């Protein structure tokens, strides 16, 4: 059974370099090439190239030729990917891939080694360090919505309640966005009758453990 074990998630500053690993097992490592593919947020995967595990010669897709380096340590049947001068656009999941060797004769060193993929290694290019969120109010008959914008914190998670936990009906706390800074921001919102806007008290309670941050923020219209 062909197996590819990839190294753990990485957080690196822009301008830095990173080296990720792909440990292969279950087959003859030097008889079958390794292919590399990444997928950035939102986008479809992008093929980066392959490396001949016999000769060691790498071939790079046009768009990855330069800052990206495929290498090997055949003695531990591991393929490596190194990226230099990391950019925001390098933030992605990086996959190694090879053949269902059973279906490709005794030896194959070409770009068709795309049958079996590792679980992927997330590389996040970030200059963020531990930081508490800034909290700002969100204000706009029928129903209306008010809330709290929990802005620029790191790392996850933040917890949010309303009126000390007493208010739960119509509360929706949204999963955080990860911006290119490496900081997170999220929003939590209470849907309420419009008449309650500015006639009733709404305080959001935001706790960010890593920074020892507790913030209570009252939210009113306008």
């Amino acid at each position: 059974q062909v197996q590819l074990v990839q190294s753990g998630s990485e957080l690196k500053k822009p301008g830095a370099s990173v080296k990720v690993s792909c440990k292969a097992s279950g087959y003859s490592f030097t008889s079958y090439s390794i292919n590399w593919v990444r997928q950035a947020p939102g986008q479809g995967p992008e093929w980066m190239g392959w490396i001949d595990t016999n000769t060691g010669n790498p071939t790079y897709a046009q768009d990855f030729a330069g800052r990206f380096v495929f290498s090997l340590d055949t003695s531990v049947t591991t393929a490596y990917l190194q990226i230099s001068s990391l950019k925001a656009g390098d933030t992605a999941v990086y996959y190694c891939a090879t053949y269902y060797v059973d279906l490709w004769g005794s030896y194959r060193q070409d770009y068709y080694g795309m049958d079996v993929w590792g679980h992927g290694t997330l590389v996040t290019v970030s200059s963020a360090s531990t930081k508490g969120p800034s909290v700002f109010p969100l204000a706009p008959g029928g129903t209306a919505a008010l809330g709290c914008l929990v802005k620029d914190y790191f790392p996850e998670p933040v917890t949010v309640s309303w009126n000390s936990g007493a208010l739960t009906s119509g509360v929706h706390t949204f999963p955080a966005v990860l911006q290119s800074s490496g900081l997170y921001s999220l929003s939590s919102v209470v849907t309420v009758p419009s008449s309650s806007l500015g006639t009733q008290t709404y305080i959001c309670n935001v706790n960010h453990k890593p920074s020892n941050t507790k913030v209570d923020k009252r939210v009113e219209p306008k």
């Binding site: 593919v37 939102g42 049958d115 993929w117 700002f136």
Partner: protein, 213 residues
């Protein structure tokens, strides 16, 4: 966008059949064999079909593939719950410099409740933030199903792109989805326009919310 074109979202009730188009060009789909991949969270990407229509050991025969002219297709006949996933077509392209190219992905949902367009709420920046010499527009998107949306912003009547950050859709407690989009401005840019608009497209239909200073 991607080199080969896939519908973002395809759906059916269990047992129904769906197809996923993959539209390319002469230099790719038109001349080379196509692979299909299935992406499930917590699971490595999985080869579903190779050389257009060949199933690896284990892939059920309700999955079938074909290619004609410059397009390929993935058919799933008799949708089951475990088929809910993102699907990607891929092919070698001789044109660019030689590289595999991928579609942008297709989310297949096995419908368990009626399609629901999203609720969209757009918040302007607060006085507090503007006082801090910053500005964030907040576009929140909930209760949509299937869980796929695309978000476009516009300053007055012009598209912006810059300063936009959008989350992936995430499942809610009621099995519909939520997403959010943030547009970062300067206080000046906020005041120097008549309005900003957040446009959310879901299953082909766009909903627009607008705020003004």
């Amino acid at each position: 966008a991607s080199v080969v074109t896939q519908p973002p979202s395809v759906s059916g009730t269990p047992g129904q059949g769906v197809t996923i188009s993959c539209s390319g060009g002469s230099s790719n789909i038109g001349s080379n064999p196509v692979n299909w991949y299935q992406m499930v969270p917590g699971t490595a990407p999985k080869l579903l079909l190779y050389t257009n229509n060949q199933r690896p050991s284990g892939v059920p025969d309700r999955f079938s593939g074909s290619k004609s002219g410059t397009s390929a297709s993935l058919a799933i006949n008799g949708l089951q719950s475990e088929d809910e996933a993102d699907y990607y077509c891929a092919v070698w392209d001789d044109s660019l410099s030689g590289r595999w190219v991928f579609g942008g992905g297709t989310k297949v949902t096995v419908l368990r409740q009626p399609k629901a367009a999203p609720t969209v709420t757009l918040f302007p920046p607060s006085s507090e933030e503007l006082q801090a010499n910053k500005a964030t527009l907040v576009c929140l998107i909930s209760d949509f199903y299937p869980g796929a949306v695309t978000v476009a912003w516009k300053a007055d009547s012009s598209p912006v792109k810059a300063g936009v950050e959008t989350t992936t859709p995430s499942k809610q407690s009621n099995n519909k989805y939520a997403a959010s989009s943030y547009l970062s401005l300067t206080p000046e840019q906020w005041k120097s326009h008549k309005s900003y608009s957040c446009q959310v497209t879901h299953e082909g239909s766009t909903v627009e919310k607008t705020v003004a200073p």
